[PDB]
Amino acid sequence: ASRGVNKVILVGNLGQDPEVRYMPNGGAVANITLATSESWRDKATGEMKEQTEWHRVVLFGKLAEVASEYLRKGSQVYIEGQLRTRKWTDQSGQDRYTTEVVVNVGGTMQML
Amino acid sequence: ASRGVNKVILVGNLGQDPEVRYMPNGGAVANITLATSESWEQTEWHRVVLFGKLAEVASEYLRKGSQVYIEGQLRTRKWTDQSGQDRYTTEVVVNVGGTMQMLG
DNA sequence: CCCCCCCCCCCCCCCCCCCCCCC
């Protein structure tokens, strides 16, 4: 598991309540989507120049349930995970790719 | 950056020479594809886009199997393809408080 | 080490974009 580092650290708020589901053979998989905003004002004072980014975080086991029990819409949380892009096929049988921050082995989540 | 933190840190090797391009006013956009793997060997590919100065250096000194350290943000952009189907794509972008660095 | 995954950021002086499958 050497050959480099895959690390993403996030601090942000949930868009909606955690969407927990069960994976085959003992579920415990919680999908949360969080926002991080950023600001600036490049071409002349625009009184604002916000820009929200949405991240798709996925927790497993213990943490999946913790989020399930204590994370609600607004919760602010700290996340440390790895990026993983998964390929899946859609209705029309076309190839799709989804990138996520999965909180696994050396991961971690924590309410703020 | 009101609201939280959005940051990704990668250390891996380019799977292919830097594909450098020059967008409109201000040509400087390099795209690289970084590989990071793990034994226990499952690898993951990353799309990192460098801009400006970082862009030129990537073009200048980075080559295929090169190992780099990257500090950036996570961005996912949507674009409809020649089919009328909405697509999304997330990449690590090295902008503001980000950095790139040649290792070894 | 890269075999490729993916079209492709716009902070931090002093909301919530929402589009997103099931490691």
From Swiss-Prot, chain A:
Keywords for this protein: DNA damage, DNA recombination, DNA repair, DNA replication, DNA-binding, Phosphoprotein
One example of a Gene Ontology biological process annotation: DNA replication
Keyword Phosphoprotein appears in the UniProt entry: yes
Modified how: Phosphorylated on tyrosine residue(s).
Domain SSB span(s) in chain numbering: 5-110
Activity control: The C-terminal tail exerts an inhibitory effect on ssDNA binding.
DNA-binding region: 54-60
Single GO MF annotation: enzyme activator activity
GO terms for cellular component: cytosol; nucleoid; replisome; single-stranded DNA-binding protein complex
Effect of H55Y: In SSB-1; destabilizes the tetramer
Effect ascribed to mutating P24S: Increased frequency of precise excision of transposon Tn10 derivatives (mutant SSB-202)
Outcome recorded upon mutating L10F: Increased frequency of precise excision of transposon Tn10 derivatives (mutant SSB-202)
Effect of V102M: Increased frequency of precise excision of transposon Tn10 derivatives (mutant SSB-201)
Keyword Transit peptide listed: no
Biological role: Plays an important role in DNA replication, recombination and repair. Binds to ssDNA and to an array of partner proteins to recruit them to their sites of action during DNA metabolism. Acts as a sliding platform that migrates on DNA via reptation. SSB or its 10 C-terminal amino acids stimulates the ATPase activity of RadD.
Subunit-level organization: Homotetramer. Interacts, via its C-terminus, with many proteins involved in DNA metabolism such as DnaG, HolC, PriA, PriB, PriC, RecO, RecQ and SbcB. Interacts with RadD.
The name this protein goes by in its record: Single-stranded DNA-binding protein
Organism: Escherichia coli (strain K12)
Annotated gene: ssb
